[PDB]
Paper text:
The crescents are covered by a protein scaffold that is primarily comprised of the [name] protein. This protein has no predicted trans-membrane domain and requires the N-terminal region of the A17 integral membrane protein to form a honeycomb lattice on the external surface of crescents and IVs. The crystal structure of [name] [name] reveals a double-barrel organization that consists of two jellyrolls (J1 and J2) decorated by another β-sandwich forming the head domain. [name] forms a trimer with a marked pseudo-hexagonal shape resulting from a parallel arrangement of J1 and J2.
Here we describe the 2.6 Å crystal structure of the [name] protein [name] and establish its membrane remodeling capacities by analysis of 2-D crystals and reconstituted IV-like particles using electron microscopy. We determined the crystal structure of both native [name] and D13D513G. The two models only differ in minor loop movements although several loops could not be modeled in the native [name] structure because of its lower resolution. The two structures have an r.m.s.d. of 0.5 Å for all equivalent atoms. In our model, residue D513 is ∼14 Å away from the adjacent trimer. The 3-D density map generated by electron microscopy also reveals a large gap between residue D513 and the closest surface of the neighboring trimer confirming that D513 is apparently not mediating a direct inter-trimer interaction in the 2-D lattice. Thus, mutation of residue D513 does not appear to directly destabilize the fold of [name] or the honeycomb scaffold. One plausible explanation for the assembly defect observed with the D13D513G protein is that the mutation indirectly induces premature or distorted self-assembly of [name], sequestering the protein away from the poxvirus assembly site. The surface-exposed residue D513, which is in a conserved patch of [name] is available for interaction with a potential cellular or viral partner. Thus, mutation of this residue could also disrupt an interaction essential for the docking of [name] onto the crescent-shaped membranes.
Numbering used by the authors:
A (entry chain B): -1 to 11, 14 to 46, 50 to 547
B (entry chain C): -11 to 1, 16 to 45, 49 to 547
C (entry chain A): 0 to 10, 15 to 45, 49 to 547
Write the structure that this text describes.
């Protein structure tokens, strides 16, 4: 109801100099006015799509918070079609910010995405919705698969960190923003039935650039520093990569990307908008089940001769070598039996060695046959399918290496396979869950800068940046940005110490996984420090 | 040899600022205390709670929390509280001294300011116990157990803790909370005795705050932003804020007006508040009347109902739409029937018909001989959030040439009264964007305009919020340590007002949601100087 | 381009530049992620020691403990508790030659990290670790080996380099005391815990961010050290003595399960919502609750009252009606309802706490293929308290009934749960059992409350959804200021904090009444940190 006597007695019962924590002198700031400015741009096909935006106005003193709008068209026709999650980020191949004196800042599309991955709002705007990312089906040539939509891509820049204090100042200079787009093939998930040829011919990127402009009265410009991300991709299947000309790096990131060039980029399933590891696994199990347990009158027809479809015993247990599969379906008609496809997908490099068989990954399958729809309605499924199984390209099941067929699904099931060309996949699975780096070594010149076995550098990245999707990262700067010059690793060119060399030991994937034959590329990102000066327009100088 | 050199700082090689040590300043001597007050209740019979803060030792205060003791709800019928029940109770909050109002806010604006604070919304409260629609079976059955909810009354005094705190220049502070009618916070069916509940219900509030007893306080003048709201006329796409001299921001949004309805909806998902939960609760409510397993043509439906026996094929054609219906274990003496016009809307006898039965493409299930019900399995439909937000009144409106609610009397009896006061847009999730274009005028000159909702995208990015509004921010300067940046008036040139004009998106006249009345809401934050000369006072910056 | 109205509104007074800053040159330093193996020592309590000393490691912060979990092989049910890595920790101590610099009890470290979802995930929390897995053969793999990471949050992390621990050419020892592995594992009777316990060893590794600083200019600082007092079992009071400069005081309750075998009917695994706990429990009871049998069901104790369901579908258990309807029941069989599955009472013709009475509707379909009932819709009033009742309390001496009338199959599936960080009297700490709280500074009442308004403030101020009744005395920003504290008056006897609570009561006929409670009181004392002749701390008085 009021302050207690014990508290009152503990204070009254003034000799020392105290900092006022109950009042502040409200400083008058620089006089300015912000404005959201939107620009249309010019489209070019060098046949890569490139959008240019020129910002040249005597009243736009500073700017930040770049947002790119993209108009997605109405998608009509036959077939399965869906956009990749965060489709807007996946459109971007490269972003460049330039003045008359050259590039001020630039970034690779995947690195922009990596920098925004911990911003759920920016990712949502990108966008990510059941409307965009579920795999929709067109049943007629004039059927609407996808309605037209607008996505917003937040182009995070070093100018956003401290709002007005970090904004790009325009020294009565012309700024150009150049966005290079990925082919539309990257952002779209589709089956064979979908007329991609026509879609590709007719699709056009329709972008618009927004930014927060500031009209500042008597701006007092000071020099600053900015970090420019630089990326190097290693050779296919080489466990090494080098970044040359490293003189002042604030950080270094290391990750892996799969390379699907030895494939047709076709996968059995995709979960759509639902993106959890369990959603990927459930979408895959769901696609296999129709061919795995068959309720038929006599041995099931329409499967390759290589298929081993066995009638389930009265026991319910089918033995596929060491693995027992318990199959029990209720309401099976008297003229019909329950069959198990014991080798739905199988892989082996040697005829009497190890076999990777997807049918062996199921231990229990129960359900009820429906006389009304003539389908089996699966109830409980016990299995050991993982995220890697859902990430195996179909090409690797039917590869030359494989001594077996070894894709014994029905023709109906194979026609439902999807082309996935997402350009920002990491690791060897869709969720980048499996850590395939067993050991990492970083060399600065000839000296070992850092080495680790487990991903403790990923744990630090995730803790320090409050991200649940980090990468193995070394950070050399722990100083607050903008108010301090960033701390860096510094070169010694005479001792040949001006290169960062990364070496990894990859995990053997275990014994005979078809995912061992997924080609990998090592990615190394280095953040170089640059000085930003505004003497005769905006200019940047690499720190050396 | 598989060993690797383990050497430290191998990447290492004037006045420098020390980043490894700091001089720990001695702060003002103070002592905080959590103080709780009961108030005085007063009653167009609107409930008002007053709390008077007067103590020579409370030097400053912040972090206001209002407690509310919700009563035990007994009786027959369906009852549930709206999500974030405690915020929806608040009509208005006012903080006053002897010199007048220091700060005040409309209930919806307090809620909009706390929408990103998941903790404060949970305390509000939001739970299965409060928000699921509970059913009372006997007149002495307990529908809802008594409960306490906490409403964090976010004020400008919390931004920088002690630095931004409200200083009581040995003045009396009065906090006045105006409550919304209990009708607004309760979701109920016709069976529930609302008349008695309303007569007997009383708001039981308590105000807490963090008080600070400060030794030799050195008070300095400061600035405060006071939110000011203007609501446009029904269906008017314009609104004006007059006497704008120093504004830090301007927000624009839409609210539906349900005065042309009885505020009854077919369904409500309860505690589960996702778009999918709203859609699933609605589909679930329609399914008992949509697919019927009956011995002969189903009874108990209006004559306007067109209930058709499903062919051996399983496909029923409703004009251009094919509905595949297949139910297992149907008894031999019975057939499967499909309600082909459960809900239908047309403005002309030969116009386009909006039919909810046409929104279903596949319905799978098993009839239960034990419970004499159909247990639905897989449903393929195209029901959206707008369908679940249609008031029942609009389906049976004078503008409809059809009946056009052909549901059973049992289904219509399960309809719920929803009077949530903080609904935005034309659907429960505020998913549909109905503003096609926005123009903001400062005087007669165009300050800002947009076609797409880029100002909402910026609001959401800058405030890290997933529920933003079209907002124009003029202040990008850090709060408390600087005088806020404002849009400033030119009275001589007539630039002393903010006029908002929107262009609403169009839609077909044959969709019941076309008849939802809309109100434009404009929120302006005006800058005020906080003085302490003879107790606390605020002065509008002009 | 900028509109004319904006240009016209702009185009003697000192203005602060908000569009440019002079980029200060910081102290020259170089960070490094350093990892150390320690020394393992053995109540045969496991203790890991890590010694940090290097002429170039000047400062450090952001301690992360790695734990290598082994491959778990054999027969039976096994799972790790959620946040396994935090639950491993009994105590963490940071020491110099001059003594302890900072230390914390494992539960208080966990409490400090509970609002950090990333740190908790790294702990870890996954279906792989936390679902209850089953081993079918003696060489079957129940759990694959895994690594967990425990972020050991310290006061040195608040302001990165500014708050970092400086090493004045001193040797810093980090000592981690581990809980017995019995605390972090959820297992059934079938699992060979004896062998697992004998063979299990903690395999830890300590990482930290080390800083090599050129010409470090050290300044004295302040640190808050958490101090915990646990009250006598069921005693609603606790005292913290020698309180001279405290920044906060926290109060909470813990259950004590020493009067039990720590066995529970169910556990939801990785799925940790209140509903997941309730659904896992209902699921475990269902196969004994509704039985499809040819004649009266066999294999239940003589005390079991299994009744054939009438044609009506309604079975009356006193005042409670249970509607049971199962489809596809074979002609030679009937539907039976177990009317006293679990029952508890302290007198014979009095009140009965009966779990079977908590069900109002049960629907399902019998499966001829698997000879099971596949349950569909269930209407019950089971709560989080029911799922938190140890099995021991159903069959206790106070109970005049049997009163666990489940099948032997169901009882064999019971799980040992020894999670060391449970609060309240239920697994979710949902039930508030403190009716009133009083805090005394000396003999004077410092604070008192009925409702948990101090928990509401804790949750608001720390942006946490799992707060405790807390009194904060410090609202001053950390590192840049000396913390504000409650200060002692030794002459007036105000140099101690006494807590008294009034517990709510659940009835004497509820098995949960017999769950023992412990009052926990946490006090944060202010200490001065000085670096004159190694690192040392001094209690503020």
């Amino acid at each position: 109801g009021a302050m207690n006597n014990t508290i009152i007695n503990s204070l009254i019962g003034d000799s020392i100099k105290r900092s006022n924590v109950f009042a502040v002198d409200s400083q008058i700031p620089t006089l300015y006015m912000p404005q959201y400015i939107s620009l249309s741009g010019v489209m070019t096909n060098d046949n890569q799509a490139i959008a240019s935006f020129e910002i040249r106005d005597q009243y736009i003193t500073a700017l930040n918070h770049l947002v790119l709008s993209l108009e997605l068209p109405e998608v009509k026709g036959m077939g399965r079609f869906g956009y990749v999650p965060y489709v807007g980020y996946k459109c971007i191949n490269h972003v460049s910010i330039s003045s008359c004196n050259g590039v001020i800042w630039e970034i690779e599309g995947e690195e922009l995405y990596n920098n925004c991955i911990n911003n759920t709002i920016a990712l949502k705007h990108s966008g990510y919705s059941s409307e965009l990312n579920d795999i929709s089906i067109g049943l007629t040539p004039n059927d609407t698969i996808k309605e037209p939509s607008t996505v917003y891509v937040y182009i995070k820049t070093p100018f956003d960190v401290e709002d007005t204090f970090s904004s790009l100042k325009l020294s009565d200079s012309k700024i150009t923003v150049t966005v290079t787009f990925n082919p539309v093939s990257d952002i779209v998930i589709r089956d064979s039935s979908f007329d991609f040829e026509t879609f590709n011919k007719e699709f056009v990127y329709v972008p618009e650039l927004s930014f927060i402009g500031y009209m500042v009265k008597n701006v007092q410009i000071k020099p600053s520093f900015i970090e420019k991300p630089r990326r190097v991709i290693g050779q296919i299947n080489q466990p090494t990569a080098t970044v040359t000309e490293v003189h002042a790096a604030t950080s270094l990131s290391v990750y892996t990307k799969p390379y699907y060039g030895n494939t047709d980029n076709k996968f059995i399933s995709y979960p759509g908008y639902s993106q959890d590891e369990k959603d990927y696994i459930d979408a895959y199990v769901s696609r296999l089940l129709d061919d795995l347990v068959i309720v038929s009158d006599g041995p099931p027809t329409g499967y390759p001769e290589s298929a081993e479809i066995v009638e389930v015993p009265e026991d319910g247990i089918v033995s596929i070598q060491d693995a027992d599969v318990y199959v029990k379906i209720d309401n099976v008609p008297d003229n019909m039996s329950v069959y198990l496809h014991t080798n739905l997908l199988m892989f082996g490099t040697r005829k009497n060695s190890f076999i990777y068989n997807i049918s062996k990954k199921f231990s229990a399958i129960t359900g009820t046959y429906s006389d009304a729809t003539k389908r089996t309605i699966f109830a409980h499924i016990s299995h050991s399918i993982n995220i890697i199984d859902t990430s195996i390209p179909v090409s690797l099941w039917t590869s030359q290496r494989n001594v077996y067929n070894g894709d014994n699904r029905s023709a109906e099931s194979k026609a439902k396979d999807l082309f996935i060309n997402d350009p920002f996949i990491k690791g060897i699975d869709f969720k980048n869950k499996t850590d395939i780096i067993s050991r990492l070594e970083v060399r600065f010149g000839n000296d070992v800068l850092y080495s680790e076995n487990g991903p403790i550098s990923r744990i630090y990245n995730e803790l320090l940046t409050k991200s649940n999707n980090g990468t193995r990262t070394l950070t050399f700067n722990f100083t607050p940005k903008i108010f301090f010059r960033p701390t860096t690793i510094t070169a010694n060119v005479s001792r040949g110490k001006d290169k960062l060399s990364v070496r990894v030991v990859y995990s053997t994937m275990g014994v005979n996984h078809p995912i061992y034959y997924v080609q990998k590329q090592l990615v190394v990102v280095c953040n170089d420090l640059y000085k930003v000066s505004y003497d005769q327009g905006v200019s940047i100088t690499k720190i050396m």
